[PDB]
Design a protein around this nucleic acid. Structure first.
Length: 276
RNA sequence: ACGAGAACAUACGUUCUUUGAACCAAGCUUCAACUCC
């Protein structure tokens, strides 16, 4: 199981509800949406969907990482038992569990001027990473196709505010074996690592002793082909990445657009870190 | 088929107005056109 490390040399804007604020990381269907839009840039979008639909391409979402420390969101248990301010724990320090600051959020103030009229300002929330940090994306069984797409994505930009002028990155794989054995392990409680949602006939079996938050996950369709306007998406509600489940489930790539000239998918497949 | 798409933090605006590098202060003090043969 491989690593995908993302080094940003420019600020990022990962919006979650509005342009004025931003988020440290980006989700999994955000990266999958970027890969779909770039694959239909290359025309190979159909067999990329047939790869990601049949589990050979299965990635988690982005996580913070500092120099030789890979992080995850604080897994949230039914713990009966200060470190309550900390949002991220190192990925190998879960056994110890049972200082940290990457970057700083900034707000960039912009304007749009009209020539024979008064101007109008708008402001963009940004995030800038420190010099020896960034984000990393977990992936198992790397494919030549996704190695080609991320090689091609880095000149289009992950992030929100494009193409002015923020999201750009250079990636490298840099596989690791100190944390592959964590994912080869098996335990009794399995934490989630991506924004996921089980299929309708297994949500009950997935929902037994869980600890989760829903997140709304919608927005606008970003294409020049979906139905001659800016149509919103069917707001899918997926589990938060810092969830825990005692029993596993497998997600689906749900179609959240069913009215334009092409389908709009949303990645909601599961990715577990099994722990005792 | 990225809470996304499109968007100059832009337009206007004299580091400027008033202000003697001035005031006070002897080119002066002491000296033989001279001594010797």
């Amino acid at each position: 199981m491989k690593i995908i490390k993302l080094y940003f040399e420019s600020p990022v804007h990962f919006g979650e509800k509005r342009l004025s604020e931003s988020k440290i990381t980006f989700s999994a269907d955000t990266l999958f949406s970027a890969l779909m839009i770039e694959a239909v840039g290359l025309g190979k979008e159909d067999e990329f969907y047939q790869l990601a639909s049949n589990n050979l391409v299965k990635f988690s979402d982005a996580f913070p990482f500092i120099d030789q420390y890979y992080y995850i969101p604080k897994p949230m248990f039914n713990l009966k038992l200060a470190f309550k301010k900390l949002l991220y724990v190192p990925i190998d320090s879960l056994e110890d569990y049972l200082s940290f600051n990457l970057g700083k959020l900034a707000l960039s103030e912009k304007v749009q001027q009209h020539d024979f009229k008064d101007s109008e300002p708008y402001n963009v929330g940004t995030f800038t990473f420190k010099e020896n940090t960034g984000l990393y994306v977990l992936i198992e069984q790397t494919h030549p196709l996704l190695e080609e797409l991320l090689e091609n994505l880095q000149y289009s930009g992950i992030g929100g505010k494009r193409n002015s002028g923020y999201g750009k990155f250079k990636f490298e794989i840099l596989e690791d074996s100190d944390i592959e054995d964590l994912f080869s392990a098996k335990g009794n409680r399995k934490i989630l690592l991506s924004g996921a949602l089980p299929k309708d006939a297994e949500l009950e079996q997935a929902l037994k002793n869980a600890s989760y938050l829903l997140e709304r996950r919608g927005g606008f369709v970003q294409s020049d082909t979906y139905a001659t306007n800016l149509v919103k998406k069917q707001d899918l509600y997926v589990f938060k990445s810092g969830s825990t489940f005692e029993n596993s489930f497998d997600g689906d790539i749900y179609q959240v657009g069913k009215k334009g000239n092409h389908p709009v998918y949303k990645y909601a497949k599961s990715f577990f870190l099994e722990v005792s």
